[PDB]
Amino acid sequence: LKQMQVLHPAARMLVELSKAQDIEAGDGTTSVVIIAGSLLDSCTKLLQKGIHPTIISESFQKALEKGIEILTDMSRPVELSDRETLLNSATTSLNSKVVSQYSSLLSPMSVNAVMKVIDPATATSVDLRDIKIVKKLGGTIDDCELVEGLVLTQKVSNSGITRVEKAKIGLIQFCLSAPKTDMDNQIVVSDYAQMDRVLREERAYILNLVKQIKKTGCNVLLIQKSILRDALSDLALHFLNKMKIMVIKDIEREDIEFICKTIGTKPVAHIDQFTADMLGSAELAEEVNLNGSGKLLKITGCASPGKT
Amino acid sequence: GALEDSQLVAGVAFKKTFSYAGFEMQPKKYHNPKIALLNVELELKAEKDNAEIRVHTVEDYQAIVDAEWNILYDKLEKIHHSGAKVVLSKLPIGDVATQYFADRDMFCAGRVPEEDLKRTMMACGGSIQTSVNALSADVLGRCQVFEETQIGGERYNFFTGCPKAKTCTFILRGGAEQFMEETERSLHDAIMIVRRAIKND
Amino acid sequence: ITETKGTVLIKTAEELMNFSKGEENLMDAQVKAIADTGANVVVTGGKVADMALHYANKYNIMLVRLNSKWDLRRLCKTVGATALPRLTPPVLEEMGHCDSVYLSEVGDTQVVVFKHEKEDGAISTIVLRGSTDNLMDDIERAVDDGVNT
Amino acid sequence: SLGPNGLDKMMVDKDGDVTVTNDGATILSMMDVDHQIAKLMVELSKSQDDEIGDGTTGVVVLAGALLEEAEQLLDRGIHPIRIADGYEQAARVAIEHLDKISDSVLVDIKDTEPLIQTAKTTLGSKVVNSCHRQMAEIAVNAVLTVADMERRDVDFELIKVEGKVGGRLEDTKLIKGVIVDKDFSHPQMPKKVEDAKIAILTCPFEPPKPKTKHKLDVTSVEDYKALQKYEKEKFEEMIQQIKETGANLAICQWGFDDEANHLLLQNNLPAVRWVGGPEIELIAIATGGRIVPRFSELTAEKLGFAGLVQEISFGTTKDKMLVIEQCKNSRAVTIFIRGGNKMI
Amino acid sequence: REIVHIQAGQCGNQIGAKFWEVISDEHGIDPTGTYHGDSDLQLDRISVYYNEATGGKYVPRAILVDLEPGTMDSVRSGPFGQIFRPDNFVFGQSGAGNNWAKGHYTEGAELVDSVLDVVRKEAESCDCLQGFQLTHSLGGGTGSGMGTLLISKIREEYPDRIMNTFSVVPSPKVSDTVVEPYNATLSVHQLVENTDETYCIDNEALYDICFRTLKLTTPTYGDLNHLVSATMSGVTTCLRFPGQLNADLRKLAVNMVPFPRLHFFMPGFAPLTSRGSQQYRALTVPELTQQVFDAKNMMAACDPRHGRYLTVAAVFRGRMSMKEVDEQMLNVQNKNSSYFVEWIPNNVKTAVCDIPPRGLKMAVTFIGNSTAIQELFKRISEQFTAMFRRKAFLHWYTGEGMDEMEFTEAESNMNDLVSEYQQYQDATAEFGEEAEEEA
Amino acid sequence: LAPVNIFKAGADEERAETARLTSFIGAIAIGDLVKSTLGPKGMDKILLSSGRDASLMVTNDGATILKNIGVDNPAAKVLVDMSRVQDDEVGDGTTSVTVLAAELLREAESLIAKKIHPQTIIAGWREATKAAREALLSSAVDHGSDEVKFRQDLMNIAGTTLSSKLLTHHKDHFTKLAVEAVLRLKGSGNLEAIHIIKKLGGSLADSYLDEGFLLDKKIGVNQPKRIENAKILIANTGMDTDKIKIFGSRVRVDSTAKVAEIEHAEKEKMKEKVERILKHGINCFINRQLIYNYPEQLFGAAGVMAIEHADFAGVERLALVTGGEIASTFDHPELVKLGSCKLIEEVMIGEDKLIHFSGVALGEACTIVLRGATQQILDEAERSLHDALCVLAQTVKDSRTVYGGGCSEMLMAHAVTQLANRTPGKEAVAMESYAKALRMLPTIIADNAGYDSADLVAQLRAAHSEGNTTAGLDMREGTIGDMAILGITESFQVKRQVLLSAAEAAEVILRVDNIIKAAPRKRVPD
Numbered sequence A: 001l002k003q004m005q006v007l008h009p010a011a012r013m014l015v016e017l018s019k020a021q022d023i024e025a026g027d028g029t030t031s032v033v034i035i036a037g038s039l040l041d042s043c044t045k046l047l048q049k050g051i052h053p054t055i056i057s058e059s060f061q062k063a064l065e066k067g068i069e070i071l072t073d074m075s076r077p078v079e080l081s082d083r084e085t086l087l088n089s090a091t092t093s094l095n096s097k098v099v100s101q102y103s104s105l106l107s108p109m110s111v112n113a114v115m116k117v118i119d120p121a122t123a124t125s126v127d128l129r130d131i132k133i134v135k136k137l138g139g140t141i142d143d144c145e146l147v148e149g150l151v152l153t154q155k156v157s158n159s160g161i162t163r164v165e166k167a168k169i170g171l172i173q174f175c176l177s178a179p180k181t182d183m184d185n186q187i188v189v190s191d192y193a194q195m196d197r198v199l200r201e202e203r204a205y206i207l208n209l210v211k212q213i214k215k216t217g218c219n220v221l222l223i224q225k226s227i228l229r230d231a232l233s234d235l236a237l238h239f240l241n242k243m244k245i246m247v248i249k250d251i252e253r254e255d256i257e258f259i260c261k262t263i264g265t266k267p268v269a270h271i272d273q274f275t276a277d278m279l280g281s282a283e284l285a286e287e288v289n290l291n292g293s294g295k296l297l298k299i300t301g302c303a304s305p306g307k308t
Numbered sequence B: 001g002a003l004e005d006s007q008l009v010a011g012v013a014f015k016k017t018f019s020y021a022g023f024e025m026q027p028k029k030y031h032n033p034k035i036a037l038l039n040v041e042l043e044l045k046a047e048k049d050n051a052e053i054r055v056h057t058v059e060d061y062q063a064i065v066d067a068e069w070n071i072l073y074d075k076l077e078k079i080h081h082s083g084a085k086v087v088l089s090k091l092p093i094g095d096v097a098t099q100y101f102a103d104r105d106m107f108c109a110g111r112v113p114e115e116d117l118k119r120t121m122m123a124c125g126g127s128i129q130t131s132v133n134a135l136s137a138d139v140l141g142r143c144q145v146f147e148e149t150q151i152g153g154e155r156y157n158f159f160t161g162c163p164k165a166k167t168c169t170f171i172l173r174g175g176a177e178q179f180m181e182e183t184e185r186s187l188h189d190a191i192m193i194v195r196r197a198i199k200n201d
Numbered sequence C: 001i002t003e004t005k006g007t008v009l010i011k012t013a014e015e016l017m018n019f020s021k022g023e024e025n026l027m028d029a030q031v032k033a034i035a036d037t038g039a040n041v042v043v044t045g046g047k048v049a050d051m052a053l054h055y056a057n058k059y060n061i062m063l064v065r066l067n068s069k070w071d072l073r074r075l076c077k078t079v080g081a082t083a084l085p086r087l088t089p090p091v092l093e094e095m096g097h098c099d100s101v102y103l104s105e106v107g108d109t110q111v112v113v114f115k116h117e118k119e120d121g122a123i124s125t126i127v128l129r130g131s132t133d134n135l136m137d138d139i140e141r142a143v144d145d146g147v148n149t
Numbered sequence D: 001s002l003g004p005n006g007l008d009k010m011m012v013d014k015d016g017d018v019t020v021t022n023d024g025a026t027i028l029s030m031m032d033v034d035h036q037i038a039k040l041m042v043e044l045s046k047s048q049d050d051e052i053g054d055g056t057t058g059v060v061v062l063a064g065a066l067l068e069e070a071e072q073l074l075d076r077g078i079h080p081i082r083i084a085d086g087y088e089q090a091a092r093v094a095i096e097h098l099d100k101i102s103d104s105v106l107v108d109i110k111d112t113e114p115l116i117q118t119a120k121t122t123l124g125s126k127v128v129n130s131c132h133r134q135m136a137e138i139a140v141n142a143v144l145t146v147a148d149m150e151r152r153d154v155d156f157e158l159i160k161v162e163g164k165v166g167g168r169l170e171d172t173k174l175i176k177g178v179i180v181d182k183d184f185s186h187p188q189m190p191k192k193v194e195d196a197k198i199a200i201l202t203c204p205f206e207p208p209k210p211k212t213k214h215k216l217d218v219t220s221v222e223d224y225k226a227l228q229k230y231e232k233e234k235f236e237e238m239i240q241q242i243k244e245t246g247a248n249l250a251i252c253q254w255g256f257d258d259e260a261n262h263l264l265l266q267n268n269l270p271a272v273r274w275v276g277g278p279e280i281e282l283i284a285i286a287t288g289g290r291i292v293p294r295f296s297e298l299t300a301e302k303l304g305f306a307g308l309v310q311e312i313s314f315g316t317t318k319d320k321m322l323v324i325e326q327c328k329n330s331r332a333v334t335i336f337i338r339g340g341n342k343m344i
Numbered sequence E: 001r002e003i004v005h006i007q008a009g010q011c012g013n014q015i016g017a018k019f020w021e022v023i024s025d026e027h028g029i030d031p032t033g034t035y036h037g038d039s040d041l042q043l044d045r046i047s048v049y050y051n052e053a054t055g056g057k058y059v060p061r062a063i064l065v066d067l068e069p070g071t072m073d074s075v076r077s078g079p080f081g082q083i084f085r086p087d088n089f090v091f092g093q094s095g096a097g098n099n100w101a102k103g104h105y106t107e108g109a110e111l112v113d114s115v116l117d118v119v120r121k122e123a124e125s126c127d128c129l130q131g132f133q134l135t136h137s138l139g140g141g142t143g144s145g146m147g148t149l150l151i152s153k154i155r156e157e158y159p160d161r162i163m164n165t166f167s168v169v170p171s172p173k174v175s176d177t178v179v180e181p182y183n184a185t186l187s188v189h190q191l192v193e194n195t196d197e198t199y200c201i202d203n204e205a206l207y208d209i210c211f212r213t214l215k216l217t218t219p220t221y222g223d224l225n226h227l228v229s230a231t232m233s234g235v236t237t238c239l240r241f242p243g244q245l246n247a248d249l250r251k252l253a254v255n256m257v258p259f260p261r262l263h264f265f266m267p268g269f270a271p272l273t274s275r276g277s278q279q280y281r282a283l284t285v286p287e288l289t290q291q292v293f294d295a296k297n298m299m300a301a302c303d304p305r306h307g308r309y310l311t312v313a314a315v316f317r318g319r320m321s322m323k324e325v326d327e328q329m330l331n332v333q334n335k336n337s338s339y340f341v342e343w344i345p346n347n348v349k350t351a352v353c354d355i356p357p358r359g360l361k362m363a364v365t366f367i368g369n370s371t372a373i374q375e376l377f378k379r380i381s382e383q384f385t386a387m388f389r390r391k392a393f394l395h396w397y398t399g400e401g402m403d404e405m406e407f408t409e410a411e412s413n414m415n416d417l418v419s420e421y422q423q424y425q426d427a428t429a430e431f432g433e434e435a436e437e438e439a
Numbered sequence F: 001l002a003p004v005n006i007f008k009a010g011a012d013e014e015r016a017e018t019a020r021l022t023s024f025i026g027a028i029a030i031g032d033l034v035k036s037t038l039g040p041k042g043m044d045k046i047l048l049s050s051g052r053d054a055s056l057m058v059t060n061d062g063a064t065i066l067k068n069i070g071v072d073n074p075a076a077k078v079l080v081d082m083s084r085v086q087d088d089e090v091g092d093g094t095t096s097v098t099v100l101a102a103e104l105l106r107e108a109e110s111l112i113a114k115k116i117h118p119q120t121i122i123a124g125w126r127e128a129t130k131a132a133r134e135a136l137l138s139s140a141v142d143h144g145s146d147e148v149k150f151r152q153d154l155m156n157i158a159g160t161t162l163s164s165k166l167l168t169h170h171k172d173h174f175t176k177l178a179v180e181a182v183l184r185l186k187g188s189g190n191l192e193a194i195h196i197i198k199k200l201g202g203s204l205a206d207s208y209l210d211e212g213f214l215l216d217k218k219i220g221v222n223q224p225k226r227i228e229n230a231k232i233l234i235a236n237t238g239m240d241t242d243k244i245k246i247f248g249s250r251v252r253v254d255s256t257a258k259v260a261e262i263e264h265a266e267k268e269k270m271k272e273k274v275e276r277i278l279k280h281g282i283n284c285f286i287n288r289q290l291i292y293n294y295p296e297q298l299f300g301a302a303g304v305m306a307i308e309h310a311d312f313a314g315v316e317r318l319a320l321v322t323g324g325e326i327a328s329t330f331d332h333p334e335l336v337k338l339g340s341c342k343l344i345e346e347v348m349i350g351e352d353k354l355i356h357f358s359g360v361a362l363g364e365a366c367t368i369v370l371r372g373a374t375q376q377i378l379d380e381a382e383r384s385l386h387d388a389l390c391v392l393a394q395t396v397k398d399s400r401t402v403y404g405g406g407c408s409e410m411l412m413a414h415a416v417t418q419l420a421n422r423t424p425g426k427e428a429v430a431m432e433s434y435a436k437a438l439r440m441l442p443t444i445i446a447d448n449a450g451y452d453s454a455d456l457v458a459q460l461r462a463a464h465s466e467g468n469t470t471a472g473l474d475m476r477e478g479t480i481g482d483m484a485i486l487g488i489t490e491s492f493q494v495k496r497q498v499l500l501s502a503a504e505a506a507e508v509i510l511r512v513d514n515i516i517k518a519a520p521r522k523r524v525p526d
């Protein structure tokens, strides 16, 4: 109903009606339109019989209240510790789509996702923003899987290192480049010996930063995207190679919360606060190469897992 | 106005110009004023378009900020000491000058047209000054009365009473644009005829 | 000013205040030095300044401007003076002479007249008065034919 | 459209705007004409309006009927110069008789009844006649509080006419002060004062800045810190300098900084931001104060006085206005117009 | 100072003919040569682009060169042809054929010897000349081939005079000459090391502005000359009118060109839109200035959002108040400052001329130095490389007496030039095989 | 027509017979268009746009409809202008003013057809409105002394206002929300302190008024998600690179280690400012601008909550609720007052997450959550609830009320009728026409419901003439009743504005006799 462009003014309220059920329930988005369609159809006979429309509106509300009490008397309580009931409910809402054949694999996966996000004792609502769906081409439907960790799409900038065991992961929000002040600055040269000083002093400043990072035992580094100043210079990447540090660059700003939630790291914004207390631990970090589609990254085996 | 309301002023009269905030708290009539004609822009601004300031410490910074004000207040104090009451300049006059000229009961005017200034010099008997360092008693203009009056919805400045005048000014009253334009074309025929008759009667 | 780009640089309070006074004093001496030799009229082939104009009026110096690069050269011949490329006090040899200079009007037009009382002079001018532009040009062609003869 | 029982016209603009009016000059101004003689009547109406302001529609009727009577004379064989000369002679005889039957009445603040009667006659032709007794009172009082008797001159730039929609037409009132379309800068300032001493300023509440092109060089950390201290100190001195003079409220022509706005509130001092040019010169005349361009030049002899300054709030809208009232003798005054339509 | 203007080929002659036309009608000059103005402000600097002959006549300082009489006869017979100097017309008898080799080796060699004599006679009449101006197109053989030869000869003759040029950039979407890329690559190679700066203009944006924005569904070349002639006037406008700061062409080089090799600009002209929009758009300062950073007023195929500007210059024409110009400039400088310079802040150069260009209410002119120009030069090289592999149409060039090595030589510089612009962005630095093993 | 032309091409003139024809056609056209939305049983219209990208809305308000319609008749633009002003003045009666202002002109055209000069009608009506407004004033009843009685009046006024809208399905539920919301303002007419949040989903009956406050913002990363016994500091200052040092300074150094020294001095400036903030002993921080990621971790290490980008409205509302001060420069901790709420947590409504403030100190502001099925219901519910809040705020300012349901109109219509029976001349005819127009408003209400309007109005006319000055219509059964018993009540200010504004427009239109149009501008878009 959204993709089609309906033009009748009274046909443009049905598209909003189906979006209402989607928000509150997420299912029955077709059935609610059918019910609303037949109620309006049955109204054309009453208006011919001489019923004023005001009478019709009041009478339907009378019937709606009776409808609620019949359904409630028909229902049955369900306890969250009963796994079998959840599977039967999930597979029933799933066998009406194209993946009805693969419901024998997806249905136990869907329930597992919900049970690993909430606490059944005090569960009053579920937020689906802590569950992320990643779409990747290649293969068939039968190759889907559930990852109890973090999956990153971007490849690694480092050239040579693609697998780390007993990794210590650290997150950075500052920039590894030449020094840069917000005030419009400039370096003035008036003597020939100054040229050699600038080259030497720049290399030392970048070198100092990397020595601090390696001092804490960091194996995997995550940078954050910046668009006003460079985030990873060629000189910086060369040194990080010699110290055997896996580097991942250009992490989005809008999923920093999700990353910290999953692995338990702590964002840092100053080199002076990069200590060993801000690092997360993972049993395995490796990027995997899909057959032909492209390269993918996986982080599995978190010691301090979140509810994602 | 009617056609018989036309008048001749044995002096100089011109239109009111654009004035800044504070023009309205200063007197609009004098009896024996001294007129100081200028060609100098009396407003706070930058000295030269080719200038540039480089400074290291905030102590000089505050000294530089007070330097521009001390320049402006020096010129305005130089004019006020000459005893002049009416000041006219072809260049703009800032609001700071007008408010300053208001606090001492003296009249200011800026962006005066060039032609109206030359007639004022010829009628009052002064001289245009591009600097404020040599305002002798001779470079000032003396008139017998100054006033600002309303004429047909506009405001006009009048300099009347000069006994050594060499200039007149006509104020023509019509009812429509083409009524006074045709009036002035007939006046021009009378002016030229008299000019020729002087040389040969 | 310098032909190469030149800006004024100030670093202290005194230099900011004393720049404007210094420039005016220098201009006064230059014009007074010119008037010391006895010049009565100054003719230039370019733009004039307001401060120079104000001081020229103070020292009773008549000032005219005309930029043709061909009228000025003719004027050099007429009075016998020689051109100068820099604003310097002219040498007694370099100053021309003329028996009268005045501003006059002829037939609704303002003109400037450099008149010699000398019969010969260096060059001469013929003033044409007519009732139509077409009438003058044909008479102008006749004057050329008479001169070429 | 002549006389008290006259009717009006509804003009329509180039873009679609609607204007209902009865003034003679405006109808001929908003009208678009092509005939050259028609434009001559338009210019005739405007000339009378500038000189007098009343009698714009009467003159064109007199002028029109003066031409109509000449059609018969032209046909009967009279040179129009004879007609034009005759009209001139008649006008001279009519005018000399006109001031033979005149009656000098009065000009004095004591009585004001003859002036009200004259004001009533002119308003009797408009839609304002519904309450023209009240409106006559407002008009006469407004002139006599700005009128200079010795020079025999009044200045309309000292009378501000401002109208806001809503309310009722009878809510029109005369305010012997100033009304501005602004409010207090900080939302938590008090909404009224009762012994206001007015401090009028022209410079903004920001650290100084020379106008000539300039550069400041920071070459070390101590230079950086000395600059940081100079910033925050400069914010303090302006507000201290205001308070020692005894001022109660601050009026400024430019904006305030975030730091300077809060410090004013912390020192119990209401202020107004981004006021207009002509408004400032009116407040200076109204409250009797003076305008200062620098904090340093502020003294206790330059403050004005004001009996009451308040923020008045209208109905559903967010529009708020500030009013300055109850001063001493004032040469400035404003007219406030209300009504249920923009056309009123 | 004194400047000389030289035009060659098809495109160069047309623009120059209009340029002298949109100069005479300002300064009070007429198609006979007299001066009929009453304002002395026009005649103060009248001699920078003109010579005065006895009798009050004025003549332009222009040299017209083409290898075929057809174009020169059109200008001579057409409007304003009686104004020009009689001997300044230099013409051949056979044309160039758009073979860059023919115009660079065979025909241009025997013509420059006679043209170089003329420019000497023009340079002898000036007390102190300051530089030259060249107008040519990069597609025709004479514009590229003879244009390259002329510049090389000029440099050897004249040691340190400035070399300003106005060259149109080819738009390959409008490919025209099947062999377009050969002509463009070689001339740019020579231009890089022998000119101070070049002002590029493409016919694409020349096509778009009139057609889409204004009107005339079928705009012919005649209108295209007017649009570029509007831009001719402005970069050059300050020079012919006085100002508070004497802005000469030499200080333009130092103040606009930070690096001697990255010296290619693209100009801008705001006040020209739809005829109805010419009336109903409230042509105030900030909306008029808003056209400087727009995606429509540009006349080059280089996206700025995917680039970083180096230096900007703003020229204003008209009699305004001083305040509002700076106020909006202060606003605009910080409004879209996010997409601004990398390390050269406060680039804005402000110039104001009282008398606007004749015809309209308001006018300005903008110059910008972009890092997106490489997007244009890259595409030229990519098309060039695809053709050189097949050696297509190569005999028409090699067979005229030029070694094949030159085609490979010129390619190297184009890759070198592109690498230079790429280096100053630091954003474009951001794999199919499976080799990701131990080290 | 004179043979000589005086107007440019495209300009047109209309005169007496044609001018008064056009002006009356336009007025009755707009009056009859909106009569269907009047009274407790009026219906709603659909507005769909050809220009604004096919926008669609369903409304009953008489002012929203007249704003969107593209009228072009000169006389119809006068009617639209009064309705917009009336909405901005008292917020109700937009439909009643335009119908009444149109019914006066309908009777005015008949009088002209009987050869009565227009000035005679206006002078006649001027006496009629004076006696009409005076009779209304004598009908006013003024409470306010008793809280219990005044509380009842507010429920009666809100109940009547919601009748004609979509909220009438749940009038009992929505009357309590509207009344209790206005009692929070403590007499200050700052309606902007009430934030109506509308989000799609669920039934219309799930709407409620929150006991505390709600903010639709997000807290910083790695900070406490919930705090008990919070102390709130409200600030308006810069924290994302606060180093906007107003001067035009610049850095000029001859090395690189100097730059790295100055860069470190930048962070020391931000760190020092954060310490001065924490000196106030706060545990919750609210700012109206952005917060950079460096000061974000400073609060994250200190265990504080930081809210960012809460605009001017979001900050001023929090000040009233918690009583804190919007502070800056953080140099004197003693002079700044903090807020206090009992609990702060995150709640989920629909899908989104909002910050919940509970147990606030003052509570002089509030938030209202609206629920519904379609965007048309949510917009209609919010617009309907705006009418109730405004008219209640006027009642608190001036607590005198007048009965409604047609009881008010019939009273004033009788007072003019008594006057017209003593006045001789043609003015007597005009005054009677005024009574015919006022009595149409009760008639129109009865027509929309399907009742015999002529019979019911006839009974009202007799009842009001014999002294039963509280008689009026009863919609639920279509008979007559007492308003003192049933409780239909309006505001004195609202009815006064409806009467005075309507009578004026029929005056300004009626004096017009000549219509002139300038030649319109042609469409040549950019």
Ligand SMILES: Nc1ncnc2c1ncn2[C@@H]1O[C@H](COP(=O)(O)OP(=O)(O)O)[C@@H](O)[C@H]1O
Pocket: A027, A028, A029, A030, A031, A032, A092, A093, A095, A096
């Ligand atoms: N195995 C089944 N047998 C019978 N009915 C089924 C079965 N599975 C699903 N349904 C019916 O399908 C209906 C809706 O399915 P669906 O196509 O998802 O529509 P909606 O979008 O309204 O949920 C439900 O009413 C349910 O009763």
Ligand SMILES: Nc1ncnc2c1ncn2[C@@H]1O[C@H](COP(=O)(O)OP(=O)(O)O)[C@@H](O)[C@H]1O
Pocket: F037, F038, F039, F040, F062, F092, F093, F094, F095, F096, F097, F160, F161, F163, F164, F404, F405, F406, F445, F473, F474, F475, F488, F490
């Ligand atoms: N329950 C009721 N019984 C009788 N009259 C009512 C009732 N509710 C509302 N009304 C009347 O409906 C009239 C129209 O009000 P409304 O429909 O809101 O349009 P408006 O925009 O003019 O207020 C009011 O005069 C009011 O007296």
Ligand SMILES: [Mg+2]
Pocket: A027, A028, A093, A094, A096
């Ligand atoms: Mg389903």
Ligand SMILES: [Mg+2]
Pocket: D054, D055, D056, D057, D125
């Ligand atoms: Mg009148």
Ligand SMILES: [Mg+2]
Pocket: F092, F093, F161, F162, F164, F387
């Ligand atoms: Mg209502």
